[PDB]
Coordinates of C-alpha atoms and ligand atoms in Angstrom, one line a residue:
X30 CA -6.7 0.8 31.1
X31 CA -3.0 -0.4 31.2
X32 CA -2.2 1.2 27.8
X33 CA -3.6 4.6 28.9
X34 CA -1.7 4.4 32.2
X35 CA 1.8 4.0 30.5
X36 CA 1.0 6.5 27.8
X37 CA 0.3 9.1 30.4
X38 CA 2.7 8.3 33.3
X39 CA 5.9 6.9 31.5
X40 CA 6.6 10.3 29.8
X41 CA 6.5 11.2 26.1
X42 CA 9.6 9.5 24.7
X43 CA 12.0 11.5 22.4
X44 CA 11.2 11.3 18.7
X45 CA 14.7 10.2 17.8
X46 CA 14.4 7.2 20.1
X47 CA 11.7 5.7 17.8
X48 CA 14.2 5.5 15.0
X49 CA 17.4 7.3 14.0
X50 CA 15.9 8.1 10.6
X51 CA 12.4 8.8 11.9
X52 CA 12.5 12.4 10.6
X53 CA 13.7 11.3 7.1
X54 CA 11.8 10.7 3.9
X55 CA 13.6 7.3 3.6
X56 CA 12.0 6.1 6.9
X57 CA 9.1 3.6 6.5
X58 CA 6.6 4.0 9.4
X59 CA 5.0 0.6 8.7
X60 CA 8.1 -1.0 10.1
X61 CA 7.2 0.4 13.6
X62 CA 5.4 -2.2 15.7
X63 CA 1.7 -1.3 16.1
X64 CA 2.0 -1.4 20.0
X65 CA 4.5 1.5 19.7
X66 CA 2.4 3.8 17.4
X67 CA 0.3 5.7 20.0
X68 CA 3.4 6.8 21.8
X69 CA 4.9 7.8 18.5
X70 CA 1.9 10.0 17.8
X71 CA 2.5 11.8 21.1
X72 CA 6.2 12.1 20.4
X73 CA 5.5 13.7 17.0
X74 CA 3.0 16.2 18.5
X75 CA 5.5 17.1 21.2
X76 CA 8.3 17.5 18.6
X77 CA 6.0 19.8 16.5
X78 CA 5.4 21.8 19.8
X79 CA 1.6 21.4 19.5
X80 CA 1.1 20.0 23.0
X81 CA 2.9 23.1 24.6
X82 CA 1.6 25.7 22.1
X83 CA -2.1 24.7 22.4
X84 CA -1.7 23.6 26.1
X85 CA -3.2 20.2 25.3
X86 CA -4.2 18.3 28.5
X87 CA -2.0 15.1 28.6
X88 CA -4.7 12.8 30.0
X89 CA -7.1 14.1 27.4
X90 CA -4.6 13.7 24.6
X91 CA -3.7 10.1 25.6
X92 CA -7.4 9.2 25.7
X93 CA -8.0 10.8 22.3
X94 CA -5.1 9.0 20.6
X95 CA -6.2 5.6 21.9
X96 CA -9.9 6.2 21.0
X97 CA -8.8 7.2 17.4
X98 CA -6.8 4.0 17.2
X99 CA -9.8 2.0 18.5
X100 CA -12.0 3.6 15.8
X101 CA -10.3 1.9 12.9
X102 CA -11.3 -1.6 11.8
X103 CA -8.9 -4.2 10.3
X104 CA -9.4 -4.3 6.6
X105 CA -6.2 -5.1 4.6
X106 CA -5.4 -1.5 3.8
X107 CA -7.7 1.0 5.4
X108 CA -6.7 0.3 9.0
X109 CA -4.9 2.1 11.9
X110 CA -1.5 1.5 10.3
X111 CA -2.6 3.4 7.2
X112 CA -3.7 6.3 9.5
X113 CA -0.4 6.2 11.4
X114 CA 1.7 6.2 8.3
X115 CA -0.3 9.1 6.8
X116 CA 0.1 11.1 10.0
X117 CA 3.8 10.2 10.0
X118 CA 4.2 11.7 6.5
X119 CA 2.5 14.9 7.7
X120 CA 5.2 15.1 10.4
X121 CA 7.9 14.5 7.7
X122 CA 6.4 17.5 5.7
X123 CA 6.7 19.6 8.8
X124 CA 10.3 18.6 9.4
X125 CA 11.6 18.7 5.9
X126 CA 9.6 21.3 3.8
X127 CA 9.4 24.2 6.2
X128 CA 5.5 24.3 6.3
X129 CA 5.7 27.3 8.7
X130 CA 6.6 29.5 5.7
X131 CA 3.3 28.7 4.0
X132 CA 0.6 27.8 6.6
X133 CA -0.6 29.1 9.9
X134 CA 0.3 27.0 13.0
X135 CA -3.3 26.0 13.6
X136 CA -3.6 24.7 9.9
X137 CA -0.6 22.5 10.4
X138 CA -2.0 21.1 13.6
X139 CA -5.3 20.5 11.9
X140 CA -3.7 18.7 9.0
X141 CA -1.9 16.4 11.5
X142 CA -5.1 15.7 13.5
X143 CA -7.0 15.2 10.2
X144 CA -4.4 12.6 9.0
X145 CA -5.0 10.6 12.2
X146 CA -8.8 10.6 11.8
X147 CA -9.2 10.7 8.0
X148 CA -10.2 7.1 7.4
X149 CA -12.1 6.4 10.7
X150 CA -14.4 3.3 10.8
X151 CA -13.5 2.4 7.1
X152 CA -15.2 -0.9 6.1
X153 CA -12.9 -1.7 3.2
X154 CA -15.4 -0.5 0.6
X155 CA -15.6 2.7 -1.5
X156 CA -18.3 5.3 -1.9
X157 CA -20.0 3.6 -4.9
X158 CA -20.5 0.4 -2.9
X159 CA -22.2 2.3 -0.1
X160 CA -24.8 3.6 -2.5
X161 CA -25.1 0.3 -4.4
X162 CA -25.5 -1.7 -1.1
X163 CA -27.9 0.9 0.3
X164 CA -25.8 1.2 3.5
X165 CA -26.7 3.3 6.5
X166 CA -23.9 5.7 5.5
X167 CA -25.4 6.3 2.0
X168 CA -28.8 6.9 3.7
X169 CA -27.1 9.6 5.7
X170 CA -24.8 11.2 3.2
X171 CA -25.4 10.1 -0.4
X172 CA -27.2 13.3 -1.4
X173 CA -24.2 15.4 -0.2
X174 CA -21.7 13.1 -1.9
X175 CA -18.3 11.9 -0.4
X176 CA -20.2 9.3 1.7
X177 CA -17.3 7.7 3.5
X178 CA -15.4 10.9 4.0
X179 CA -18.4 12.6 5.7
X180 CA -18.6 9.5 7.9
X181 CA -14.9 9.8 8.8
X182 CA -15.4 13.4 9.8
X183 CA -18.5 12.6 11.8
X184 CA -16.6 9.8 13.7
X185 CA -13.8 12.3 14.5
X186 CA -16.3 14.8 15.9
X187 CA -18.0 12.0 17.9
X188 CA -14.6 11.2 19.5
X189 CA -14.0 14.9 20.4
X190 CA -17.6 14.9 21.9
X191 CA -16.8 11.9 24.0
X192 CA -16.2 12.8 27.7
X193 CA -12.5 13.2 28.4
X194 CA -11.4 13.2 24.8
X195 CA -11.9 16.8 23.6
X196 CA -8.3 17.9 23.1
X197 CA -9.6 21.3 21.9
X198 CA -11.9 21.8 25.0
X199 CA -10.1 24.9 26.2
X200 CA -9.8 26.6 22.8
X201 CA -11.6 29.9 22.2
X202 CA -15.0 29.7 20.4
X203 CA -13.2 31.2 17.3
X204 CA -10.2 28.8 17.3
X205 CA -12.5 25.8 18.1
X206 CA -14.8 26.7 15.1
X207 CA -11.6 27.1 13.0
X208 CA -10.3 23.7 13.9
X209 CA -13.5 21.8 13.2
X210 CA -13.9 23.7 9.8
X211 CA -10.3 22.8 8.8
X212 CA -10.8 19.2 9.7
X213 CA -14.0 19.1 7.6
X214 CA -12.2 20.7 4.6
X215 CA -9.1 18.5 5.0
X216 CA -11.0 15.2 5.6
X217 CA -13.3 15.8 2.6
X218 CA -10.3 16.5 0.4
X219 CA -9.3 12.8 0.8
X220 CA -12.1 12.0 -1.7
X221 CA -10.5 11.4 -5.1
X222 CA -13.5 13.1 -6.8
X223 CA -12.7 16.3 -4.8
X224 CA -9.1 16.2 -5.8
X225 CA -10.1 15.8 -9.5
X226 CA -12.4 18.8 -9.2
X227 CA -9.7 21.1 -7.7
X228 CA -6.8 19.8 -9.8
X229 CA -6.9 22.7 -12.3
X230 CA -6.9 25.2 -9.5
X231 CA -3.9 23.4 -8.0
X232 CA -2.0 23.7 -11.3
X233 CA -3.0 27.4 -11.5
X234 CA -1.6 28.0 -8.0
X235 CA 1.7 26.3 -8.8
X236 CA 2.0 28.4 -12.0
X237 CA 1.4 31.8 -10.5
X238 CA 3.3 30.9 -7.4
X239 CA 2.1 30.5 -3.8
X240 CA 0.9 33.7 -2.2
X241 CA 0.7 33.1 1.6
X242 CA -1.7 36.1 1.9
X243 CA -4.2 34.4 -0.4
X244 CA -6.8 32.5 1.7
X245 CA -7.7 30.3 -1.2
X246 CA -4.1 29.2 -1.7
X247 CA -4.0 28.1 2.0
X248 CA -7.1 26.0 1.4
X249 CA -5.7 24.5 -1.9
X250 CA -2.3 23.7 -0.4
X251 CA -4.0 22.0 2.6
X252 CA -5.9 19.7 0.1
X253 CA -2.7 18.9 -1.8
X254 CA -0.7 18.2 1.3
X255 CA -3.5 15.9 2.6
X256 CA -3.6 13.9 -0.6
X257 CA 0.2 13.7 -0.5
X258 CA 0.0 12.1 3.0
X259 CA -2.8 9.7 1.9
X260 CA -0.7 8.4 -1.0
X261 CA 2.7 8.5 0.8
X262 CA 3.3 4.8 0.6
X263 CA 4.3 5.4 -3.0
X264 CA 7.2 7.7 -2.0
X265 CA 9.1 4.9 -0.2
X266 CA 11.1 2.0 -1.7
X267 CA 9.9 -0.6 -4.1
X268 CA 9.1 -3.2 -1.4
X269 CA 6.7 -0.9 0.3
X270 CA 4.9 -0.2 -3.0
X271 CA 4.7 -4.0 -3.6
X272 CA 3.3 -4.7 -0.1
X273 CA 0.7 -1.9 -0.4
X274 CA -0.4 -3.2 -3.8
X275 CA -1.0 -6.6 -2.1
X276 CA -3.1 -4.9 0.6
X277 CA -5.0 -2.6 -1.8
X278 CA -6.0 -5.4 -4.2
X279 CA -6.9 -7.8 -1.4
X280 CA -9.4 -5.1 -0.2
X281 CA -10.6 -4.3 -3.7
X282 CA -11.2 -7.9 -4.7
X283 CA -13.2 -8.5 -1.5
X284 CA -15.5 -5.7 -2.5
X285 CA -15.6 -7.1 -6.0
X286 CA -16.6 -10.5 -4.6
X287 CA -19.4 -8.8 -2.6
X288 CA -20.6 -7.0 -5.7
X289 CA -20.8 -10.2 -7.7
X290 CA -22.9 -11.8 -4.9
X291 CA -25.4 -8.8 -5.1
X292 CA -25.7 -9.4 -8.9
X293 CA -23.7 -6.3 -9.9
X294 CA -20.7 -6.1 -12.2
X295 CA -17.6 -4.8 -10.3
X296 CA -14.9 -2.5 -11.8
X297 CA -12.1 -4.3 -13.5
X298 CA -9.7 -3.3 -10.7
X299 CA -12.0 -5.0 -8.1
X300 CA -12.5 -8.1 -10.2
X301 CA -9.9 -10.8 -9.2
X302 CA -10.7 -12.7 -12.5
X303 CA -10.0 -9.7 -14.7
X304 CA -7.6 -7.4 -12.9
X305 CA -4.0 -7.1 -14.2
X306 CA -2.2 -5.5 -11.3
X307 CA 1.0 -4.2 -13.1
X308 CA -1.1 -2.2 -15.6
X309 CA -3.5 -0.9 -13.0
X310 CA -0.8 0.2 -10.6
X311 CA 1.1 1.9 -13.5
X312 CA -2.1 3.7 -14.4
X313 CA -2.7 4.8 -10.8
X314 CA 0.8 6.0 -10.5
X315 CA 0.8 8.0 -13.8
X316 CA -2.7 9.5 -13.6
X317 CA -3.2 10.0 -9.8
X318 CA 0.0 9.6 -7.7
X319 CA 2.7 11.3 -9.9
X320 CA 0.9 14.5 -10.7
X321 CA 0.2 15.0 -7.0
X322 CA 3.9 14.8 -6.2
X323 CA 4.8 16.9 -9.3
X324 CA 2.6 19.7 -7.9
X325 CA 4.3 19.2 -4.6
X326 CA 7.7 19.6 -6.2
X327 CA 6.6 22.7 -8.1
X328 CA 5.6 24.3 -4.8
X329 CA 8.4 22.9 -2.6
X330 CA 11.8 22.4 -4.2
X331 CA 12.9 20.0 -1.4
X332 CA 10.0 17.7 -2.4
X333 CA 11.9 16.7 -5.6
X334 CA 13.1 13.5 -4.1
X335 CA 9.5 12.4 -3.4
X336 CA 8.4 12.7 -7.0
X337 CA 11.6 11.0 -8.1
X338 CA 11.1 8.0 -5.9
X339 CA 7.5 7.6 -7.1
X340 CA 8.6 7.8 -10.8
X341 CA 11.2 5.2 -10.0
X342 CA 8.7 2.9 -8.4
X343 CA 6.5 3.4 -11.5
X344 CA 9.4 2.1 -13.6
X345 CA 10.0 -0.9 -11.2
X346 CA 6.4 -2.0 -12.1
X347 CA 7.2 -1.9 -15.8
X348 CA 10.4 -3.8 -15.2
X349 CA 8.7 -6.6 -13.2
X350 CA 5.6 -6.9 -15.4
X351 CA 7.0 -9.9 -17.3
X352 CA 7.1 -11.9 -14.1
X353 CA 3.2 -12.1 -14.2
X354 CA 3.5 -14.3 -17.3
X355 CA 4.4 -18.0 -16.6
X356 CA 7.5 -19.0 -18.6
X357 CA 8.2 -22.7 -19.1
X358 CA 6.3 -24.9 -16.6
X359 CA 5.2 -24.0 -13.1
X360 CA 7.2 -25.2 -10.1
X361 CA 5.2 -28.5 -9.8
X362 CA 5.9 -29.4 -13.5
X363 CA 2.2 -29.6 -14.0
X364 CA -0.4 -27.9 -16.2
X365 CA -3.4 -29.1 -14.0
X366 CA -4.3 -25.5 -13.3
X367 CA -5.5 -25.3 -17.0
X368 CA -8.3 -27.9 -16.3
Ligands
LIG407 C1 -6.2 11.4 -4.0 C2 -6.2 10.8 -2.6 C3 -7.0 9.5 -2.5 C4 -7.2 9.0 -1.1 O1 -8.3 8.0 -1.1 C5 -8.0 6.8 -1.6 C6 -9.1 5.9 -1.5 N1 -9.1 4.6 -2.0 C7 -7.9 4.2 -2.4 C8 -6.7 5.0 -2.5 C9 -5.4 4.4 -2.8 N2 -4.4 4.4 -2.0 N3 -3.4 3.7 -2.6 C10 -3.8 3.2 -3.8 C11 -3.2 2.4 -4.8 C12 -1.8 1.9 -4.5 N4 -3.8 2.1 -5.9 C13 -5.1 2.6 -6.1 C14 -5.7 2.3 -7.4 C15 -6.9 2.9 -7.7 C16 -7.6 3.7 -6.9 C17 -8.7 4.5 -7.4 N5 -10.0 4.2 -6.8 C18 -11.1 4.1 -7.8 C19 -12.4 3.8 -7.2 O2 -12.4 2.5 -6.4 C20 -11.4 2.7 -5.4 C21 -10.0 2.9 -6.0 C22 -7.0 4.0 -5.6 C23 -5.8 3.4 -5.2 N6 -5.1 3.7 -4.0 C24 -6.8 6.3 -2.0
LIG408 MG1 -10.3 7.8 2.6
LIG409 ZN1 -6.6 7.2 3.5

């Protein structure tokens, strides 16, 4: 109750008041205290003019933002702070890359709202685990594929359909249908398997050049931008990349532990006895992260610095790899850990 009251009655604080570099690619949104993030969401929506443009009801918007925050659990990585940082990067793309030259206003709004909702109710486990553990989610969606992503979308729609939380309530039937369809496309694009399936079409688009009159190019660009937001922790400094690795592997190893208890053999990356982090992170950066930001650079010249910072963080991992081998004796002057 109290949180809602202040969010609604204190006024939407100016975006620059959050941080002086808030609109910069150098800013790390994970440094913002979690208690300040809901107001930051409002401040960003205001600064992008979405509240005014779509005449979003402020009481409704405040309830929506809090309910979305409440719909994330607390696994090490896939929590509200992930969603906030992803949404923040969407804002950064709006501020720095002139998205208004490529996408419709409603598409940009949909991207931002999708970022907020894209990992709703994540349980710290991937799609394979849902099928293997015969979860309720796999019962619902395994035959369609993208189990978790369909669940994230359905949670987002359930929030909208909660009384007092439909921020699109006044939209026309056409614009409402448009928004929900965009959210579906964008949230489902956060599945790695989807990204892999469209990756050649993304390269084709970047080769022939973006045609803003081509409806397929809008769709493809939206998928690329969404994945860029989802992986945006890799575009910051080394320390952020190091911390997120810690969170990512804590989550993965928990799943791997669960899988061993069910009698299944986990992936190397989820097996704490077998996983070599530097090599795995290098691989993720080279095969997944870097190509996404290279395509981004190919489409937006001003995105160059993002690819550059990811490539540098990739080299930082190679530089620090030797630190994973124990030289000399450990701090305690003992070799007891061998027994
Ligand atoms: C292309 C956008 C993908 C968005 O979805 C996810 C889902 N799960 C994990 C990630 C993710 N975010 N950061 C990382 C890092 C730092 N390392 C990552 C390393 C591997 C994988 C690939 N997956 C394989 C299947 O099991 C889960 C991890 C994802 C990783 N990842 C992204
Ligand atoms: Mg996801
Ligand atoms: Zn995510």
